[PDB]
From Swiss-Prot, chains A, B:
Organism of provenance: Homo sapiens (Human)
Similarity comment: family membership: Belongs to the TRAFAC class TrmE-Era-EngA-EngB-Septin-like GTPase superfamily. Septin GTPase family.
Subcellular location(s) per record: Cytoplasm; Cytoplasm, Cytoskeleton; Synapse; Cell projection, Axon
Descriptive protein name: Septin-8
Main function: Filament-forming cytoskeletal GTPase. May play a role in platelet secretion. Seems to participate in the process of SNARE complex formation in synaptic vesicles.
Residue ranges of the TM segments: none
Tissue-specific expression: Widely expressed, including in brain, heart and platelets; most abundant in aorta. Isoform 2 is expressed at low levels in specific brain areas, such as occipital pole, frontal lobe, temporal lobe and putamen. Isoform 1 and 3 are highly expressed in specific brain areas, such as occipital pole, frontal lobe, temporal lobe and putamen. Isoform 2 is highly expressed in prostate, testis and ovary. Isoform 1 and isoform 3 are expressed at low levels in prostate, testis and ovary.
Coiled-coil spans in chain: 1-74
Assembly and binders: Septins polymerize into heterooligomeric protein complexes that form filaments, and can associate with cellular membranes, actin filaments and microtubules. GTPase activity is required for filament formation. Interacts with CDK14. Interacts with SEPTIN5. Interacts with SEPTIN7. Interacts with SEPTIN4. Interacts with VAMP2; the interaction inhibits interaction of VAMP2 with SYP. Interacts with STX1A.
Disulfide bonds: none
Length: 74, 74
């Protein structure tokens, strides 16, 4: 009767609240994927930055070795 | 002569400074690897946390569907 009417809209009111929360976690589940692919790019960028500074220093020792070799050849 | 003595210790003083900086970048290059493997674990942990909350909600809808089905069977 009228008791089953209220026992239907309430039984769906909880479902509608779970379906909404179930969907937000799904959206946050792809949001942490985007935030993780971002840090993978920042990591790969910061790595290449340091990897070329060591190449920018490997050539400074060579330049100093050529300055030393150019003098010892006299 | 004495000019080449100072032109030797100075030529090595710059090298010793580059070799020190070249090594720090190498140590920081593995430090960003450890800091990146850490966030990969935090990401994989936070993912599994959300992935089971949606399984903790998928069973709440089933429990409510069984409560609804148990009444309609009367």
């Amino acid at each position: 009767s009228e008791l089953q009417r209220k026992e239907e809209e309430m039984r769906q009111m909880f479902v509608n609240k779970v379906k909404e929360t179930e969907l937000e976690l799904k959206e946050k589940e792809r949001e942490l994927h985007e935030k993780f692919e971002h840090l993978k790019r920042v990591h790969q960028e910061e790595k290449r930055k340091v990897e070329e500074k060591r190449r920018e220093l490997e050539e400074e020792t060579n330049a100093f070795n050529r300055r030393k070799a150019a003098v010892e050849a006299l």
